[PDB]
Design a protein around this nucleic acid. Sequence first.
DNA 1: GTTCACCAGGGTGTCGCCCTCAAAATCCC
DNA 2: GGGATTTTGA
RNA 3: UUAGUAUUUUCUUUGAUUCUGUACGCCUGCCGGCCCCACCGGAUGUGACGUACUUCGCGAACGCUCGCGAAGAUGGAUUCAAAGAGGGCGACACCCUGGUGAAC
Length: 723
Amino acid sequence: STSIHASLRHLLQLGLKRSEAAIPQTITRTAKFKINTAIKPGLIPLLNAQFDAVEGFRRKVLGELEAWWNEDPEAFQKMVKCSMKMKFQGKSSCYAWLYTHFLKGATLAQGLSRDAANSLLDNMGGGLKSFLTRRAHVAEEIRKRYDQNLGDWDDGLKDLAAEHGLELPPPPPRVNFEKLTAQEIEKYNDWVGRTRAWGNLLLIQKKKVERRDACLPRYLKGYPGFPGSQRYATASAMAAALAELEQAAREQYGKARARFAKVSAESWAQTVERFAPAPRTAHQTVSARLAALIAAQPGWQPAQLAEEILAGVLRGAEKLKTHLSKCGSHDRQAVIKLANLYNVAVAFALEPVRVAGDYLSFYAEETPKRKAFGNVRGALHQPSDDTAAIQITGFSINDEGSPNYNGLLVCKQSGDRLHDEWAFLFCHQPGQVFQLAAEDAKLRGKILTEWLGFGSQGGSRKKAEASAKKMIRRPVWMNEKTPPTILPLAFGVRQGREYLWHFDRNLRTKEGWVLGNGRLLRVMPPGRPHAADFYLTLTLEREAPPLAEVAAEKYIGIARGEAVPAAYAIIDREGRLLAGGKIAAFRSKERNRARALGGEVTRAIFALSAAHRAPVILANQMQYERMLVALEQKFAEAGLYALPSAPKYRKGDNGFIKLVGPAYTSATCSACGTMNAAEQGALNIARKFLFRTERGKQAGELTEAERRKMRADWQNWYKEKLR
DNA sequence: GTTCACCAGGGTGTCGCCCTCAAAATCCC
DNA sequence: GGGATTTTGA
RNA sequence: UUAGUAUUUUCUUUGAUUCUGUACGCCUGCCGGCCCCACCGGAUGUGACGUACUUCGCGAACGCUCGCGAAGAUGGAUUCAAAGAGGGCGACACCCUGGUGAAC
């Protein structure tokens, strides 16, 4: 065994006791199957049509809500967080008002299934709410930072500015933190940047504070972007980017005719100094070749040879030929060499202005080129996938078996229970219906089918009903002339025997898993709909076993180490260590050393816990916290540690995951505030749990922020704990 | 010969903050 | 007249 | 493979071992003459498009014969080993590419 499944198996077969404080839990889990478009490739056009029709609605409502957000942000905040008591326009929580305003008595785009729009607006409210409740905390924090700045800038920390010249930059803008906007935060962060750049520019007055601790008006950061703002941003293609870059470069080439011949006495000396000889870059190429060899013998009148060097830099017309003519914009090499040529054309074209030390006209002239080069370099990268999801709000069936929404899971089951189908019925065209009736039912307008559907009933989250959700396995009667789409599905045995045919939660033969909601996911490379992957994401729920009275006779202390990942030590209820031991660009950097190690140590932690039955003493780092989350999930899924709402409410003594903050000790026979490796560290972390048991303090709150009156306490305790 | 400030544009991750609808009541030809 | 739509919740 | 006597599928991944690793045409990129182009040339040994060949999935006639779509140095195959609960939106943290600035 020794495996996470086979160790959770032992943890379930752990007849400790049934704690009377056992609050019922629920285990939410998801089965992510793949529609088998390979077998049924005719879906791909249909599924993609539905998906791109629902993005049209998604963006329409999102943009409308953003326009209304900046127009009436107070009324918008009233709308989002409605309720049965505080209604907006006499409507309950967001979804009611969304349907009323957007999909009530409103025609839908051709090919859009108003069930898909209903689920869209159903799921919109939980994004608007997150936006609001993150903006609140942000606003508070950025108010703090603004307070700090305004209180130590232009008022309080002008002694340093008084020590030298440069009285004061422009004054900071006023930000109405009563109602702060993205625009106001933008124009304040702009001034923060201006003043930071001014401080770095005035580095001659001993203002080396870029990393030295002084001055530096901090930024206002963290303000959320209204939902959809950064999702469906227009972005930019390549051809447009290169066209705007070439327009800016040609502008500079044309206007550079005589800007050189304005002073050309010491300006040209600096021009030649900047672009002088050093895979040759565009800068290196032009500098080392064209000015170097066009100046000496030929082409006098520096103005005239400036035109010739710019003609050379702009001889990259052949690259424009390779792109526009035969071959496309998919050759990154040509695109990067053309963009570099344009950038250097501009950079050496504005050189006389740069030498003049304007930096204000120069910035204005290089803004078009700057933006164009940014949009070329940003369009050059595309390792991303466009993901759109359609959600079935639920899988419920009325008294007659007719569903309330547009999705169902079906099984064309065989006699031997070895050749079952497990497809998904989706309803999106007009006339697509199905019923969960009996084989002996006589339904009008519907024809039986070999499919067996898994509906649900109950769980209505209303005081009146407040039932317990229960599935319903009943044969599927489909419309003869208009059958709902069948999404062949594709999974593994390890995956279906977890959710579909589980020894104890077999969908068709045993009570267990409960249907939650669903999502049809499209995951396609941008602009490549025929390569789109499709998934069905079914959320199932369980009731976890009740907690157990952990009268542990042994404990498993576990601590991190260098020679060891997470060395472990098995003690009893009175310490006196019983046993000890050791546990355990993109590939090696992240995967090999994050996942393959965290997972192995986690299953080793379960192996130790279950084998010795002993609860885990674990400290209060991303791969440590992922191991902690996995242990929490798979102990809560055992009649053990009770998962807390949000990871803030860690009880510190919560079943088998008994959390103790520091160790801050040693085993030199006199403690601290050498022997073997972190094995003794885990010994002392377990003993420290035992000590804090007598002490009776909340180790979770102020795990390390407090040191006074604590460091000496454990120091003395271990200095005396030798009897 | 890199390291900081600011500016333009992307990419990769993790973290906030939210969610995992059933059941009527009402127009339909 | 079942299919589609609408409102609703602590 | 990663279930307990014992369950079906083909999913998304992650380690470790051994094998298999496509042709031409033209453009393009690197270098020299040359100084950007253009013509010359080297290696082309970095992109790209066009056409072929290998494999795969769906269809049409008799293991062959044809029509579409996918991939072909981040590929494919073997033998072990093992996770997975998903979605949404947005922010941060870091990195790459360019530019200006002075400081060292």
